[PDB]
From a paper:
L. pneumophila encodes molecular mimics of host E3 ligases, including the effector protein RavN, thereby subverting the ubiquitylation pathway for its own benefit during infection. Using protein crystallography, we show that the fold of RavN has only residual resemblance to conventional eukaryotic E3s, yet its mode of interaction with E2 enzymes, host proteins that are important for the ubiquitin transfer reaction, has been preserved throughout evolution. While control reactions lacking either GST-RavN or an E2 underwent no noticeable poly-ubiquitylation, efficient poly-ubiquitylation was detected upon incubation of GST-RavN with the E2 enzymes UbcH5a, UbcH5b, UbcH5c, and UbcH6, but none of the other E2s, indicating that RavN was indeed an E3 ubiquitin ligase that preferred a select set of host E2s.
This approach proved successful in producing a RavN fragment (residues 1–123; RavN1-123) that existed as a monomer in solution and that crystallized readily. The U-box domain resembled the zinc-finger-containing structure present in all RING domains, but lacked the Zn2+-coordinating sites which are substituted by a network of stabilizing hydrogen bonds and salt bridges. However, in the case of the RavN U-box domain, the position corresponding to αA is occupied by a segment of the loop L4 (residues 37–42; L4RavN) that connects the central β-hairpin with the equivalent loop L2E3 without altering its relative orientation. In fact, for all active RING-finger/U-box domains, the L1E3, L2E3 and αA elements create a conserved hydrophobic surface that serves as the docking site for E2 binding, as investigated for RavN below. The remaining three alpha helices (α1, α2 and α3) and the connecting loops (L5 and L6) are folded as a “cup” or “goblet” (colored slate in Fig 3A) that surrounds the base of the U-box domain. Superimposition of their structures with that of RavN revealed the presence of three residues in RavN (Ile8, Leu43 and Pro47) that create a surface area analogous to the E2 binding regions present in Ark2C and CHIP, suggesting that these residues could be important for E2 binding and, thus, E3 ligase activity of RavN. Notably, owing to crystal packing, helix α3 adopted multiple orientations among the three RavN1-123 molecules present within the asymmetric unit. The angles between different orientations of helix α3 ranged from 56° for α3A∠C to 134° for α3A∠B and 137° for α3B∠C.
Numbering used by the authors: -4 to 122
């Protein structure tokens, strides 16, 4: 119509629909056997301990450009909004060229909680 649209995702960080661009953090998590979910967040890949909506600790990185280039695919987007429905391993291979069951995932870091714990312990023992 008169109004355009851009692909958006519901950002768990700010709890708001957010325009997807090349600065969006995008990754895959596994939520079941042959069931994977595409996630997008505005920040936090290096600081969060797990994925916000599933608390998955393991993920497969996906370039934002790959998701943007599929923005008209009805599997991933419904009315220009990122789907919350899972996709099969075959669909993952077809859309993103990654076999997750044959690729080592990355893991969210535990560094922030470790630093918090060390900060408390040092404060206890200082005067
Ligand atoms: Na954290
Ligand atoms: Na989290």
């Amino acid at each position: 119509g008169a109004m355009g649209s851009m692909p958006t995702y519901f950002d768990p960080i700010m709890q708001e629909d957010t325009v997807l661009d090349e600065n969006t953090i995008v990754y895959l998590v596994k939520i079941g056997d042959n069931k994977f979910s595409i996630k997008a967040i505005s920040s936090g890949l290096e600081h969060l301990p797990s994925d916000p909506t599933t608390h998955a600790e393991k993920y497969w990185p996906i370039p934002a450009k790959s998701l943007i280039d599929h923005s008209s695919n009805k599997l991933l987007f419904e009315e220009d909004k990122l789907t919350n429905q899972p996709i099969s391993k075959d669909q993952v291979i077809e859309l993103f060229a990654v076999d997750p069951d044959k690729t080592e995932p990355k893991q969210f870091s535990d560094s922030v909680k470790r630093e918090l714990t060390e900060n408390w312990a040092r404060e206890v023992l200082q005067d």
